[PDB]
Design a protein around this ligand. Structure first.
Ligand SMILES: O=C(O)c1ccc2nc(-c3cc(Cl)cc(Cl)c3)oc2c1
Ligand SMILES: O=C(O)c1ccc2nc(-c3cc(Cl)cc(Cl)c3)oc2c1
Lengths: 115, 115, 115, 115
C-alpha cells in the first residue's frame, strides 16, 4: 500500500487501537470525495487503505476520529478529529506514512515520504 | 479576546509572521461557514478575531495557510494547511488560545483554555 | 528578560502551573552547573530567571520537573523530566523563549528566538 | 530487544538515518553510566541496543545526537541533543519504543510501552 497511517496515544503510552480513519480526495467541483477508510490495528497501524492503481495524484485529506477514541477511554477530547491535508503524487508515485500523536487537547502529525 | 491564534516556526525558531488564518463555524446543514480571519503579527499572534457576543458554543475549524508561509521562505512544504477542529463549550469564563508549531513536513497544535 | 520558559498541559488544555524549572550551564570540566531556577506562574510562565549580564553564550540545559507535575494531578507519568539542551549564540539582539508541551507519555519542546 | 529507538526528520519528511543514540543508566553514586549505543538504520530505527538480560530496572537516559544530524545536512541546529529520561521496568519487564520527531529548533518525543 502506498498510503499508511500510524496513530499513537500520548496519555497511555500505547498505539491508538481501533481508531477510525477516513481519507477524502478533492474533486473537480472543490468538494471532498470519499476515497478510502479503515481502522488502526493493535499496533496503531492502518495498512491496505488503498492500492497503487487507485492512489492517483490529487489533494487528500486524512481525518482521524480522535473524538470517539477519547470518549471510549472516558477522556474529554477537545478536537473533533485530526485532519491532515496534502498534495500527493504530483511528481510521480510516492509511498506516504502519515503519523499522528494524540493528546486530549493537542495533536502532532508528520509525514514520511519515500520514492 | 475570547479566541487567539499563535503560530511558531520550528525551522528558524521564530514566530511565523504574516500567516493567513481562517476560522470557520459548523453550520446546521453540516457545512463549514466563514467566521473570522486574519494574518499573524510580528509576534506570530493573531488577536481580535472575534468578540465575546459573536463567539458562541459550537464546532470550529482553524485553518492556517502553512503552504504559503513555507513557499515565501523558499522551503518545500508537505501540507496544504494546518486545520484544528474543535468543540467550544461554555464551562465558566474561558479564553481560547490555539497554538500551532510548524515544520515543513509536520505540525503540532494545542489549545490553551484559561480563566 | 533574555530567557523565559513557558509550560503547557496537553491533557487538560491549560498552562502547567507551579512546575519546577532548573537551568544549568555547561562548565569547562564538561559538568552541568546550576544557573537559574524557579516555578511556573498561573500563566505557565517563568520570567526573571536571569539577567542580560549573567546570560552569556554557552551550552544550556533547561530541566522541567514534569514527573512532580503529573503526580500532583494523580496522572501516571513516563518521564523523570523534560530536558532541553541548546547552544545560546549572540547573533544580534535576542530573547529566548523555551516552550514545552506536556502529556503523560510525551513532550514537545521548541525555542522561539526573537529580536 | 526490549528497547527500540525510532527517529524521524520533520524538515525532509523522512526517517533520520545514521543518527547516533547513546543510552545511560543512573548509577548508585547519581552519575550516568554508559549502558548501550548505536546508530539508526535507513528506516530511522535502532534495534539490538540491548537484551532482556542486560535491561534491568533503573533510570535511563536516551541521548539522540541531533547536532551531528543537522550539521551533516547543512542546517543550523538549536539543540545539542534530544535527551529522554525515564524509569524502566520498575513493575517488571516491559518493551519500550522511544520515538523522536526532529526539527532544527524543536523536538517531540513519545514512548510506547508494552507488557
Ligand atoms: O500563549 C503563548 O504566548 C504561547 C507561547 C509559546 C507557545 N508555545 C506553544 C506550543 C509549544 C509547543 Cl512545544 C507545541 C505546541 Cl503544539 C505549541 O503554544 C504557545 C503559546
Ligand atoms: O514504532 C514505529 O514504527 C513508529 C512509527 C511511526 C512513528 N511516529 C512516531 C511519532 C509521530 C509523531 Cl507526529 C510525534 C512523535 Cl513524538 C512520534 O512515533 C513512531 C513510531
Amino acid at each position: 500500500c502506498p498510503l499508511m497511517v500510524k496513530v499513537l496515544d500520548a496519555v497511555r503510552g500505547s498505539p491508538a487501537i481501533n481508531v477510525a480513519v477516513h481519507v477524502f480526495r478533492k474533486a473537480a467541483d472543490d468538494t471532498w470525495e470519499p476515497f478510502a477508510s479503515g481502522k488502526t490495528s493493535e499496533s496503531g497501524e492502518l495498512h491496505g487503505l488503498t492500492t497503487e492503481e487507485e492512489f492517483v495524484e490529487g489533494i487528500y485529506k486524512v481525518e482521524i476520529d480522535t473524538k470517539s477514541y477519547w470518549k471510549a477511554l472516558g477522556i474529554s477530547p477537545f478536537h473533533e478529529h485530526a485532519e491532515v491535508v496534502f498534495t500527493a503524487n504530483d511528481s510521480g508515485p510516492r509511498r506516504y506514512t502519515i503519523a499522528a500523536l494524540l493528546s486530549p487537547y493537542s495533536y502532532s502529525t508528520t509525514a514520511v515520504v519515500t520514492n
